[PDB]
Amino acid sequence: DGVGNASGNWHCDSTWLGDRVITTSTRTWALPTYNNHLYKQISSASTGASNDNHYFGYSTPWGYFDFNRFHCHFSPRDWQRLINNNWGFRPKRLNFKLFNIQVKEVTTNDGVTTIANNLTSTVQVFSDSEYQLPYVLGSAHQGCLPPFPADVFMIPQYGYLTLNNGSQAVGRSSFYCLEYFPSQMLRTGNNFTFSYTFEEVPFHSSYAHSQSLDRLMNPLIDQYLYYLNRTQNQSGSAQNKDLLFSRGSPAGMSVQPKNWLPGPCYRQQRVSKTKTDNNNSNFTWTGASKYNLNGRESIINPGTAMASHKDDEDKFFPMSGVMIFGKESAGASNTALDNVMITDEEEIKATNPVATERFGTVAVNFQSSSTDPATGDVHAMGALPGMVWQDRDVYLQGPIWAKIPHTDGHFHPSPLMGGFGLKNPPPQILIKNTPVPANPPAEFSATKFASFITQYSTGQVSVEIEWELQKENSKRWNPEVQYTSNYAKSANVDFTVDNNGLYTEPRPIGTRYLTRPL
Amino acid sequence: DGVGNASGNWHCDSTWLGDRVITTSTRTWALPTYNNHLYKQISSASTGASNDNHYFGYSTPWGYFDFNRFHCHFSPRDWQRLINNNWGFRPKRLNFKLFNIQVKEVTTNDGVTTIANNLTSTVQVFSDSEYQLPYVLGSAHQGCLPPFPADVFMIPQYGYLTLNNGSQAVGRSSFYCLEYFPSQMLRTGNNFTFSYTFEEVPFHSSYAHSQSLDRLMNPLIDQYLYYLNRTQNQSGSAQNKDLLFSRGSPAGMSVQPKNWLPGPCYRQQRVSKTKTDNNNSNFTWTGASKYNLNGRESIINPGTAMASHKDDEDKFFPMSGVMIFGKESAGASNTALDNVMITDEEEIKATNPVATERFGTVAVNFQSSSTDPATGDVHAMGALPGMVWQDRDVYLQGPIWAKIPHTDGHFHPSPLMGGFGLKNPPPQILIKNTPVPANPPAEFSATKFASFITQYSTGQVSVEIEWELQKENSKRWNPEVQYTSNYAKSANVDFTVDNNGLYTEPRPIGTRYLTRPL
Amino acid sequence: PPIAIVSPQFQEISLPTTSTVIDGSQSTDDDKIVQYHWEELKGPLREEKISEDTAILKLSKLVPGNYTFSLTVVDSDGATNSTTANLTVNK
Amino acid sequence: PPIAIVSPQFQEISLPTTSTVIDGSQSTDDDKIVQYHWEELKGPLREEKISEDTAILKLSKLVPGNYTFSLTVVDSDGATNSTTANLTVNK
């Protein structure tokens, strides 16, 4: 209750209870004035983009909070403390608070900005808790809470895309006016609070199977089911076709009757990190996996949950099948290989296929005395009955949830970037400086306003997600593989600040370090 | 409860009850912005220091309060009132308060600083009451509360050093992000208060033993225990070896069976205050006492509690065995002898040895008819059973407590600079201006912030330590030696201000003036 | 490079007392220094050399004349720097 | 060594149907085998060679005559073993 009183305190705890962990995080924000308070439409006809890159939409002056990355809540020690002894985690409830609002206003009088504190100006905040809006969150954008808590961040701008016939607007293209929602006027003494409880989303499997899928049998006893071992008796001269069956196997494990199947597949392209073993074309977009939706092509990227490469093929990666997080000194256009972080995905080699590899070979023809048994090569495979797979790993950088789109049907709604597919996700919290106009003229005018006071806000924002942990129940004997720091005389400590204060996350940390048997 | 209301009053009492003394002190502080809000690491590789002077650490923008000197609580009259009739003192509890916060913000517009009062900006304060941080306090640094109450002081900057392989960083080097602790946002109307209760630390012995340790016998009666007086009968010609024992002693006091032992010793170097009786080398660091810890040498300084010199040898002092407090007009580099205050430590000559003297002589060989009884010279001596000693004196300038480091073992945890070794010391109170950013650009940017509003805070801070006194119980007849002011026509009054207001403490005041028998 | 510095370059030892120390332990670096290496340039013979591969010298039995030792430090990775010392030993 | 074994050594393909498979994928080892390498010794020209650096062949357009390929496997660490195959192709 201002003005000479703080409207909230700085909470940045991370408490570890028995079966639940409460990760509070508080950041300092700064909201500018976007579009100079206008609902300017955005399309592709101004730039003139490609046929698959046409869009049509609107760009509000509202701004949103997107706490939809894992490092907005977990410090790297808390992430290490989680992923080393937990077979799973899911969020229970969140608790969002927005306090200590300061509405400054800047005067650029004669080339000198004189930022002056304004006290009567307000700030509109609403949480779209009924989902009437486009849900831009979960599209893996920037403008989150920063990783390191001592960073002032800048709030994104809420734009949205709707239906288009190219860069035109079909009569189904919805326009959303966001002052047509009840917001909350916040002076410099008020605060925005709300609470939210997640669904019963499944636990994210933070373990790696210590058994293969085609290695789920007793290596000593042989089976009681037979199979065809041989369609040609070797009588040392020529063909006989005596159809020899025999029991097995203790040793011929590749031919036994299994019981389950590996997961779906959709092949990406095998691309070497070493530049000398790649084709001299371009490539991408020529030999990439892509889909036609309304007559425009889009790369799958990263596709279904598949392993990255085979055993000891660390140089290869799927062309668009991996999360590629950028480092610092990495621009937003044509960065080299060193300044990115390709997340190697290899802990799911047991159940899931390899994204650069076929998912088996079906037969084509009918074998007879006349025609040889030709087999065809399978590349894409929809889900058969009896397939098991395991979803894509999450990361300390990567996204937490996504919105399951409200369609009539959906198959296994896990997001392809990893995370928790939520029907009712955390609602979008949208924020906007109330437009304070400059001096109007003395005679009445019909035209709206071509002059406002240039201003911006700042303040703090607390997000407090309670998670639900799944404690491991292992009877493994030998030690696990756990995420450790590199014990060496190092030049700089990883996941810390530098000589001039730049928080640099050095590597992507997954969550699959423990071993449950399959 | 501001803004037009003070959030606390100025308390600077010092009340003397029967067995306890409550010394309140309130100062005006000023907290700047350090590092421009960055966790810049600090190491030795930038400067390129010596092999024993390599370090590695971090330097936060936080600032700490260090009320860890005795004159932050005791006026020189209250110190005199304490040390003259008290055989001991220890603190019971403290009470820390932080009020009347004013957050100014400075605009250096066209070379003219225009300091403007800001009302919505906050100040983060937390007391690290669980000891997760490095405890920099007790390292005898500057930036305390000032001695004289009418002084505005500037808050230190909280940096910390961790493990290094030179100027590298081993994988045990911890990084502490200090916004990952729950702070308390304080506007211009709020106040930070907490309370603390000390342990049952022993009383600091503020007395000097009026008996020696080797003079603890009745000077009239002789003992009943014998000893060897003579290994050679004088029959006026030559050697006889008749092994003459005889009783004693009333007079041969140096040879009697004593019962206890003087304390441990570790020799420093005998250095004259008169420059003509010193070696012409340098010296120090050539003939100093130093220890190897992880392969790097460090001067002991001031070492174990030992006396400074013998009887009437005031010109000598141990090279690093004395507290050397600086006066004013004393720089932080290569100051002469006049501008410092070498604390003479001579009241513990009874129990403790002399730091420039051997602690006795052991024997080396086996005496026989063939070989003479050669004796070796003892210099360093660990604690034998039956040693008594007395800890180092405290001063009006010197430190109050220190933190006993959380190791598996420690022997007699008194700090070598004197004071109260506390397992759980008073917690570090860390303070930091909340970063208020300048105007962000209109398009969203990923990079954090290269521009903040330059600001600083000011305010008052009260520290109120309740002490527990040990009233003397003496039956001494003749008067004691007590700390008196020099009664003379003087040019300037000691422990007061000057012609232009500089509070100058003229001399270090110990606490050992009273006499308890040993 | 590996920068080394000797205690003074110039000493003055009075006879008969010949027992000095050259302290090449204030030699700096940006990393650790692996070893310190002492050598000798000038001077007559018959001296008790003690620990030439260490930091702090312990020099004894010095003929009045001109001794000249030399400290050489080695960084990791290897880099040398030879700074010398003069022993103006006079009666 | 790296021991290799070919599917039969001796095949019998009847004309006109020329589409066979030599399965050098039953070649064993005590560790993994890094690659399988096919070559050719005999036979006329004009064939569509498909994936000589793989396991299972896909042979097409075979002139009736005598072809002779050769499989070579490579262990980690490197060890070779060349076992050949004969293609008795008759009408």
Short description:
The structure is cut from a larger assembly and holds 2 copies of chain A (518 residues) and 2 copies of chain C (91 residues). Chain A has 518 residues and is an all-beta fold. Helices cover 2% and strands 28% of the residues of chain A.
Task: Please characterize this protein's 3D structure.
The structure is cut from a larger assembly and holds two copies of chain A (518 residues) and two copies of chain C (91 residues). Chain A has 518 residues and is mainly β. In chain A, the strands form ten sheets. In chain A, strands 1, 2, 6, 7, 9, 12, 13 and 28 form an eight-stranded mixed beta sheet that branches. Chain A is built from one helix and 29 strands. Chain A starts with 13 loop residues before the first strand and ends with a strand. The longest helix of chain A is centred in the first third of the chain and has 9 residues, at 76-84. Chain C has 91 residues and is mainly beta. Chain C has one domain. Chain C has strands spanning 10-14, 19-20, 33-42, 59-60, 66-75, 80-90. A four-stranded mixed beta sheet of chain C has the order 1-6-5-3, with no helix packed on it. Chain C is elongated and about 45 Å long. Classes of the chains: A mainly beta (518), C mainly beta (91). Chains in contact: A-B, A-D, B-C. The B-C interface holds B 44-45, 48-54, 165-168, 280-282, 285-287, 297 and C 3, 7-8, 11-12, 20-21, 23, 25-33, 56. The PDB classes it as virus. The entry lists the keywords adeno-associated virus, AAV1, receptor, aavr.
Name its key features:
part of a larger assembly; 4 chains; A: 518 residues; mainly beta; Empty Capsid Viral Protein 2; eight-stranded mixed sheet; four-stranded antiparallel sheet; 29 strands; elongated; C: 91 residues; four-stranded mixed sheet; 6 strands; Dyslexia-associated protein KIAA0319-like protein (chains C, D)
